[PDB]
Each structure stands twice: as structure tokens, then as C-alpha cells.
Amino acid sequence: PLTLNFGSVRLPVSADGLLHAPTAQQQLGLTQSWEAALVEHGLPETYRDFGAGPEAAVSVPDFVALAFALDTPEARRWQKRARELLARAMQGDVRVAAQIAERNPEPDARRWLAARLESTGARRELLATVARHGGEGRVYGQLGSISNRTVLGKDSASVRQERGVKATRDGLTSAELLRLAYIDTVTARAIQESEARGNAAILTLHEQVARSERQSWER
């Protein structure tokens, strides 16, 4: 219950995410004494309990920066993988997203994603509907802000920076994402049935739906 998994690679870690340094040294082809490596590559000297007493430990970002500090046959494989991950993440290769979600044994990481994908689907459906009914320009952003200030309790811009967040939807709990996804879905349905057309009309309707969902606080 302490391992990162990459194909046939096994990297034991501490409870705080530090790699078992001898295993990592095996993976990067590092035959140097760990001390020599610490000096040459600028790493801290620390140990962690991997179930076998204290052992030399190195963090994941230390391991990565080291894989690129090294030119070993093995470290080069890891360099290649970093390059490839950039490309695949850029294209939207969700098989990489699945491997990431599957790699974190934490049930809350996986449920965070499930709620996040409901938010994504509701927002895509809402935007498709708004665009097909004449919304343009800042309409879309406004709807986002409306949906946000309803669930968060403060306006979208202020909350985003108060939490140190670039995109609101990235930093939410599963419940907040579901409330947003629900509001966005209900407004998509409301637009489609009432055939609300125009920036102002759509925004007014979204205000009514989001405000109604806020009123649920009473319960």
C-alpha cells in the first residue's frame, strides 16, 4: 500500500510521496553513492520508512529533475516519457488521464474526477444550447460567473483569487461540482423548452434557475 506503478516499474513511496531512493537509483541507472549524487545534483539528504526501517528517500520531482540531469541509458527512458506526456496531455489523450486517475489509489481523487466530468458535460451542453439560441460574446462567461456566485456564496472573481485558483471548476469539492453541473443542466433544459433567444434572455433565465437552486439553503 505504498507504491507507484508504471507498466512494469514499481516505485515504493513514503506516506508523504517520497520515493525509495535505491529503487529510484536503479530506475535512473544511478550507480553513484547516494551522497555523491546528492552533492552533484543538488538534492537533500533525507530518509523515510518504507516498511523496512529508515531508508534513503528522494522526492518524485527530485527523481524527475535527476532523470534530466543524468544521461544514463535508463534515465533517458524517463526523459522520453516526459516529452511524450507533454504531447499526449496537449492533444487530449484521455488514456493518459485514465492512467493518472487509476494510479492514485485514493477514492476521493477518482470521485473528484467523476464530479468534475459531470461539471464538464453540463457546461458543454449549456454552451451548445446557449450558442444555438443566440448567446454571444460575454454571455458564456457571465453564465459561468452566475453559476459560480450561486454555489460559492461570493462572486466568482473574488472567490477564485481568494482560493488561489485560476479556473474555478478546478478547485471544487464533489458537492460543489454537482451543484454547478445540476444548475447548468437545468438551464440548458430551460433554454431548450422555452426557446429563450438572445444574450439578455438567456442570462435572465440562468439567473432564475441559479437563484432558485440557491434558495434550497432553507432545507
Add this chain to the structure above:
Amino acid sequence: APLTLNFGSVRLPVSADGLLHAPTAQQQLGLTQSWEAALVEHGLPETYRDFGAGPEAAVSVPDFVALAFALDTPEARRWQKRARELLARAMQGDVRVAAQIAERNPEPDARRWLAARLESTGARRELLATVARHGGEGRVYGQLGSISNRTVLGKDSASVRQERGVKATRDGLTSAELLRLAYIDTVTARAIQESEARGNAAILTLHEQVARSERQSWERAGQVQR
């Protein structure tokens, strides 16, 4: 749409199939060299794509990445460092970049495939855990299930199960129905926690009340009375 790939305030205009606008890449990779000369040095095809601004010189995603590691410009170095950071994040199991990858892929089945791989939201589990932390009842499972089911689906648990060929209700449902069900459970858990409902009557009352509120809301959105 001015389709763009997004990393912080990093904006990369793309074609409908995801190829990059080469002049933008030149900004991001620090290339003041003419694009043609770059094509020569790096072994790239003469490619153009429709970016909503007529045909413009284009470079593929893996080509751009290959350039970031070919170049040593200050800007290219930032892209190299991002690659390293992503290796670290993916290794750790950082699911929020997994979400960002999913959103960069505009195709809706990318989203539904990931949802299929993933566990449910857990809203039903959170509601049942919450009820377990309060009085509740020994057998609330059928009750909470049916209460929400008749709210969102429109028919009793047995009826929904019969009409669509289902053993576990969720087997035959659409995303809207699943979201409405999960939503009811989420807000019900919240109602219990906010009122500190401890008796079974308070808990079941709050669950039915939020279910009724959300039904009435859907009905107004659907403009239906029945």
C-alpha cells in the same frame, strides 16, 4: 470557434482536429526565425490549416514538443520544464491534470469513456454514510433509493426496473437522470448536516423535501405540470 489549448494563461490556437498555429508556437518557442527556415532546420512538412483566419502555417502537437526539446531559447526552456512537471504530476497520480486533459479533448465520448472507467461520484454513498452517522433506520436503502427514483425518473423503482431491463436502477439511466439522483443525495446529506437531523423522521423528511424541491425545479425548467 477560436479553438485553443490552455495551460494557465497559455493559449494555443488550433484547427478543429487539434493542430497548432505555427506563428503562435514561434512566440512560445522564442523563434524570430522565419517559419520556412525552421521547416528546413527541423525536418518539418510544409503544412497549412484553417484557423478561422484563412490558411496559416501549422505545426502538429508532437512537432511543437519536439521543437521545445530541440530549442534552447528561454521560452522553449519553460516548455521543457513543464514537461518535467507533468511527469512528476502524473507519477504522483495528480487527477486534476487528468481533468485538464479530458477538457482539452472536445469530443464528448472522451468524457463518457473516462466516466465509464471511473467510480461514480459517490453521492449515494455519502448520503448513506451521513444517514448512518445519525439515527436513520436499519433499512433506509430501499427508502432513499425509491424516494429519489420516483422524483427524477417519474416512476416507481419496480416500474423503472421493468421498463428498461434493469437490475440496479442506474444500469439503464441517462446522465441527466444520474446527475439529478446524485444531486438529490448531495443536497440531502447537506440538509441533514445543516439541521443536524438525528431522528429518522427528520432525515427522511429532509430527503423527500429536497427531492420535491428539485422535482418542482425540473418541472419548471421543462415547463410541465402533471
